[PDB]
Amino acid sequence: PHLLENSWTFWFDTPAAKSKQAAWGSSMRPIYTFSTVEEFWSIYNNIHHPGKLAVGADFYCFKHKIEPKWEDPICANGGKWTANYPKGKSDTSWLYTLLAMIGEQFDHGDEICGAVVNVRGRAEKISIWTKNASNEAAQVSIGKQWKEFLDYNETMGFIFHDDARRNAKNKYVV
C-alpha cells in the first residue's frame, strides 16, 4: 500500500454527545486512526461527510495523538485558518483539505496539527489548525497554499488559540 508520512485520527463531536457533555469537548470521540492512503479511503467513504451531518456536528482529522484542543500542548501555541462554505457545499473542499494534509502537500507542513469541519445552522466552516502561530511566515504560506488548494477566493483569517482561549480577532489575513 501507500504509507502516509503520518498517522491521522478521525474524531466526531456529535450533537447527541454534546447533549450529555460535562465540559466543552469532553464528548469528542476518536473513531479511527489510519496510516495508509488506501485505509484513508476505506474509512473516509464509510463515514458521514459534512453535507449529511446534523447542525452542531464537528468532524476532525488530526495527526495521531494530537487532541483537537486549544489546551492540547502541541496545539497550545498555535492557531487556525478558517474558510466558510454554504450549507451542503463543503464536502469537496473538506476532502481536498484532507488529501492536502495527509499527502503532506504543504510547504510548511510540519506546523499542521489537523483540520475540522463545523456544521452549523447558516453555514459550514473548515479550519486548519497549526502549531507555531508566531511564525507568521509559516502560517501565511500555509493559508495561501490552502486557498490555492481549495480555489477559495475570499479573504481568510488566522486566529491564535491563545486569543481564542468570539471576541477573538484575526492576527493574519490572506
Numbering used by the authors: 52 to 216, 220 to 228
Which of the paper's sentences describe this entry?
Hence, allelic variation in genes for the translation factor eIF4E has accounted for differential susceptibility of their hosts to Pepper mottle virus (PepMoV), Pepper vein mottle virus (PMMV), Potato virus Y (PVY), Tobacco etch virus (TEV), Lettuce mosaic virus (LMV), Barley mild mosaic virus (BaMMV), Barley yellow mosaic virus (BaYMV), Bean yellow mosaic virus (BYMV), Zucchini yellow mosaic virus (ZYMV;) and Pea seed-borne mosaic virus (PSbMV). Resistance-breaking isolates of these viruses are not uncommon and comparative genetic and molecular analyses have identified the virus-genome linked protein (VPg) as the predominant avirulence factor. This is supported by in vitro biochemical and yeast two-hybrid assays that point to a direct interaction between VPg and the product of the dominant eIF4E susceptibility allele (eIF4ES), which does not occur with the resistance variant, eIF4ER. In this paper we describe this structure and report the impact of a series of point mutations in and around the cap-binding pocket of pea eIF4E on infection with PSbMV, and use the protein crystal structure to provide a three-dimensional framework for interpreting these data. The monomer is comprised of a central 8-stranded anti-parallel β-sheet flanked by α-helices, although one face of the β-sheet is largely undecorated by α-helices and this is where the cap-binding site resides.
In preparation for a structure-function analysis of pea eIF4E in relation to PSbMV susceptibility we determined the crystal structure of pea eIF4EΔN51 by molecular replacement, using the wheat orthologue as a template. We therefore designed a version of the pea protein truncated at the position equivalent to that used for the crystallization of the wheat protein. The pea protein was co-crystallised with the cap analogue m7GTP. The X-ray data revealed eight independent copies of eIF4E in the crystallographic asymmetric unit, which assemble as two distorted tetramers, and within each tetramer a maximum of approximately 600 Å2 of protein surface is buried between pairs of subunits. Since only monomers were detected in solution, we conclude that these assemblies are simply crystal packing artefacts. The cap-binding pocket of eIF4E structures are characterised by a pair of tryptophan residues (W75 and W121 in the pea protein), which form π-stacking arrangements with the 7-methyl-guanine moiety (m7G) of the cap. These residues are located on the β1–β2 and β3–β4 loops, respectively, defining, in our views, the left and right hand sides of the pocket. The m7GTP ligand is further stabilised in the cap-binding site by a van der Waals contact with W180 on β5, and additional polar interactions with E122 on the β3–β4 loop, R171 on β5, and K176 on β6. A superposition of the wheat structure with chain H of the pea structure gives a root mean square deviation of 0.708 Å over 171 structurally equivalent residues.
